[PDB]
């Protein structure tokens, strides 16, 4: 009751996983359930090591709010999507009460907030467009995106599906959404490769990660369009169960980290760029 099952997911620099006996300096223990084969429910927890901005937030939360935890990595999906009205991902781990809370680059939107409770946002984010070459594109709302085939030839751009970004483009821009799907990227790394090689003209994704990526890009050729503009501004948050007793102390603790300078320190520790 003071010991909490917490779920997380890897996405640098917020959560970074390293192979391990004991987890060394500034990392914490996080287990990941790895199956024996693809034709069995059988599996085994592999002991690994977690670090990063959100891991540091977690330590700090644990210190101040006074709980212990067992941290594990999500296996059934990623951040969280509702599929046939059933939540997968970190969101579903909380929703089906496997985890007391979820920590990581977890974007707050309306639909997730219907089924879990979220802390105050502690990282600004939204939706940004990253390019690799010069462009005149305004933002997500540019005609090149909304009505792509108005142009011959059209722009080729995509996201990583099944997260808060795709869920947003699907609600707001139906035509853009069905045009984009053929350019779905399997991950941020993949997209960046496509951008640099020119098989992708633009990559539409979470602003905080995009800003980070551009921050650590060698040659500094990757930028976010429009002065790093952010459509649909929101934040990462700690997802807790609906009606959680923990939300209050977690919130005040977070807001205290802000007054402490503790957040700014985390920010410079992990999010310092070279560009």
């Amino acid at each position: 009751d003071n010991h909490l099952s917490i779920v997380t997911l890897e996405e640098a620099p917020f959560v970074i996983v390293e192979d391990i006996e004991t987890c060394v300096r500034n990392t914490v223990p996080c287990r990941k359930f790895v199956k024996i084969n693809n034709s069995t429910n059988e599996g085994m927890n592999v002991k690994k090591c977690c670090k990063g901005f959100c891991i540091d937030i977690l330590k700090k939360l644990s210190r101040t709010v006074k709980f212990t935890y067992d941290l594990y990595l999500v296996t059934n999906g990623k951040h969280g999507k509702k599929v046939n009205n059933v939540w997968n991902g970190m969101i579903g781990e909380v929703v089906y009460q496997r985890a007391v809370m979820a920590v990581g680059s977890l974007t707050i939107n309306e639909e997730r907030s219907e089924v879990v409770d979220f802390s105050v946002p502690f990282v600004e984010t939204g939706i940004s467009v990253m390019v690799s070459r010069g462009t005149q594109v305004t933002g997500l709302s540019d005609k090149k995106f909304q009505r792509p085939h108005d142009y011959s030839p059209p722009f080729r751009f995509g996201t990583v599906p099944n997260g808060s970004t795709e869920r947003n483009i699907r609600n707001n821009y139906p035509y853009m959404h069905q045009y984009m799907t053929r350019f779905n990227q399997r991950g941020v790394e993949d997209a960046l490769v496509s951008l640099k090689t020119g098989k992708l003209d633009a990559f539409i994704y979470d602003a905080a990660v995009l800003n980070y990526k551009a921050g650590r890009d060698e040659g500094c050729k990757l930028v976010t369009i429009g002065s790093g503009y952010i459509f649909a501004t929101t934040g990462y948050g700690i997802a807790l169960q609906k009606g959680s007793p923990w939300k209050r102390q977690i919130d005040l603790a977070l807001l205290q980290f802000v007054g402490d300078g503790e957040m700014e320190e985390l920010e410079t520790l992990w999010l310092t760029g070279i560009c």
């Binding site: 707050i108 939107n109 309306e110 907030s113 219907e114 979220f118 105050v120 946002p121 600004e124 939204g126 947003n168 609600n171 707001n172 459509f231 649909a232 501004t233 929101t234 934040g235 919130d251 005040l252 807001l255 205290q256 802000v258 007054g259 300078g261 700014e264």
Partner: protein, 262 residues
């Protein structure tokens, strides 16, 4: 029962203008404010209020905070503490909801409940064009003397900010002698060179540098912060007010208010 809405004068979020002769005034609402008199409120937060009102189907009455303050907690003198400003009105019952550029912090959140942020912004510094300083770390700011004078708004979140850290104490003791009653007055005192630097919300300050082209910001946010709707610790409306704010970020409404008012 109707909702009592307190707000505060703060362009471009709440414009305050006098009703014309008939008692009548872009969506505009009748609001009463300092003994009280009918007046015309409009702007960003008003548009938001009207969006929440229609969305969640409620009626409201708007008035301006009596002491013209955002709100901090001061010692009564002794022993008791009390909240002034919009914060005090909400806690007392004179308001049911604060709709305003109300900054979220640990101190206020201890007592009230904020919606999710309808506006992400931060703190920056306003100056008159001829002035140049690096930022919040310039020698003239961190090592104050009445030869270079800067202020913030009294009983504001920025006030709380500087009083909170022992390490910010000398800055705070310098600001204490120069702090203004309203941001409007402080912005005015910067144009007249009566004030050298105004430390305040970037959302507000960059809108003024945007139109009063004799003022500029330096530079540069030095602190992130956000605005949310104030409600008391109960509250039935609290969960659905957040969902609405999230919805409006997501579907473009908040982005539109930006472009209509900033």
């Amino acid at each position: 029962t109707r909702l009592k809405i307190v707000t505060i004068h703060q362009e471009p979020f709440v414009y305050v203008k006098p009703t014309m002769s008939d008692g009548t005034c872009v969506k505009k609402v009748i609001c009463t404010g300092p003994h009280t008199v009918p007046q015309c409120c409009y702007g960003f937060c008003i548009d938001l209020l009207i969006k929440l009102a229609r969305t969640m189907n409620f009626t409201y009455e708007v008035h301006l905070v009596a002491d013209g303050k955002f709100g901090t907690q001061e010692r009564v003198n002794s022993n008791k503490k009390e909240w002034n400003g919009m914060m005090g009105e909400l806690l007392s019952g004179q308001a049911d909801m604060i709709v305003a550029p109300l900054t979220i912090n640990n101190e206020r959140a201890q007592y009230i409940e904020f919606s999710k942020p309808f506006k992400y912004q931060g703190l920056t510094i306003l100056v008159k064009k001829g002035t140049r300083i690096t930022g919040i770390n310039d020698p003239r700011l961190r090592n104050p003397s009445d030869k270079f004078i800067y202020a913030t708004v009294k009983q504001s979140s920025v006030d709380i900010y500087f009083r909170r850290q022992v390490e910010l104490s000398t800055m705070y003791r310098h600001m204490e002698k120069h702090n203004y009653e309203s941001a409007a007055e402080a912005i005015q005192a910067v144009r007249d060179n009566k004030l050298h630097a105004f430390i305040w919300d970037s959302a507000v300050l960059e809108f003024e540098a945007s139109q009063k082209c004799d003022l500029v910001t330096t530079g540069e946010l030095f602190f992130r912060s956000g605005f949310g709707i104030g409600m008391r610790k109960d509250s039935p409306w609290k969960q659905n007010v957040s969902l609405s704010i999230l919805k409006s970020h997501e579907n473009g409404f908040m982005e539109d208010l930006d472009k209509t008012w900033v």
